[PDB]
Amino acid sequence: ASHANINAFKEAVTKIDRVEINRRLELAYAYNASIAGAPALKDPYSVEYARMLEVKEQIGHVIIPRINQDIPIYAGSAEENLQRGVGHLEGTSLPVGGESTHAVLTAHRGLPTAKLFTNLDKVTVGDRFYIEHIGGKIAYQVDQIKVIAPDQLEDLYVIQGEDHVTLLTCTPYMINSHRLLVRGKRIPYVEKTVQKDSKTFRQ
């Protein structure tokens, strides 16, 4: 079902005019610029703000090759969304990258019917993950892995001059008393070449 959703997003994007894509991206950049220029983030584990990015109800998908996950991203972190894929944390930057952006994406550390971010503990610094949105695919390299208590969101705010994405889930596995944050930093990337990115192959 999720992979069906991803295929739907992909096909749909191909049918969109490039000038149309670009206008919508500009809306997202502007949105992010307001966040960067400015709070009230709330832990999802106890919407239309991103409409410009939405295609087939999704704002894109996140790929994490080390653990072979490819999961659709939905705007907002309502439990309804977290039951079917990754949620984007409202109040954080939209996941299209850029100077002074920090997008936060979250998923359950396992559900009875879906692995989701179950194996996120196996990602190590230097591993890479990727976000495909309406404008193409961007890459991040993990630079920081952190465990925090549920009431600390300071790590989730924008860092001026920088381009980050944090993958947020609960930990330890089957306990979920804390939050695991796997953060990446933007790196240059162009898809569909002979490039191989695994840390094993690298560098």
Numbering used by the authors: 42 to 79, 86 to 93, 102 to 258
Task: Show passages lifted from the paper.
The pilin subunits of GBS are assembled into high molecular weight polymers via a transpeptidation reaction catalyzed by specific pilin-associated class C sortases, through a common mechanism involving specific motifs present in the pilin proteins. The pilin-related sortases, which are integral membrane cysteine transpeptidases, cleave the LPXTG-like motif of the pilin proteins and, via the Thr residue, covalently join the C-terminus of one pilin subunit to a Lys side chain (ε amino group) on the next subunit. In this work, we present the high-resolution crystal structures of SrtC2 and SrtC1 from GBS PI-1.
The crystal structures of GBS SrtC1 and SrtC2 from PI-1 were determined at 1.87-Å and 1.8-Å resolution, respectively. The refined model of GBS SrtC1 includes residues 42–263 for chain A and 43–246 for chain B. The refined model of SrtC2 includes residues 56–236; the first N-terminal residues 41–55, and the C-terminal residues 237–256, were not visible in the electron density maps. Although SrtC1 crystallized as a dimer in the asymmetric unit, the dimer interface is only 615 Å2, suggesting it is not physiologically relevant. Analytical size-exclusion chromatography under near physiological conditions (pH 7.5, 75 mM NaCl) indicated that both enzymes are monomeric in solution, even at high (0.5–1 mM) concentration. GBS SrtC1 shows an identical arrangement of the catalytic pocket except for the Thr rotamer and the replacement of Phe86 with Tyr92. The lid residues 39–44 and 53–60 of SrtC1, and 89–95 of SrtC2, could not be modeled due to a lack of electron density, while the conserved residues of the DPX motif were well ordered in both structures. Unlike SrtA, GBS sortase C enzymes contain an additional N-terminal extension, composed of one (SrtC2) or two (SrtC1) α helices and a lid that blocks access of substrates to the active site. For both GBS SrtC1 and SrtC2 structures, the lid overlapped the LPAT peptide that is covalently bound to the catalytic Cys in the catalytic pocket of S. aureus SrtA. In particular, the conserved motif DPY or DPF in the SrtC lids overlap with the LPAT peptide, with the proline in a similar position in both the lid and the peptide. These observations suggest that the conserved residues in the lid that interact with the active site of GBS sortases are pseudo-substrates, insofar as they mimic the binding of the LPXTG motif in the catalytic site. However, SrtC1 showed the highest Vmax value for BP mimicking peptide (4.44×10−2 µM s−1) while SrtC2 for the AP1 peptide (2.60×10−2 µM s−1).
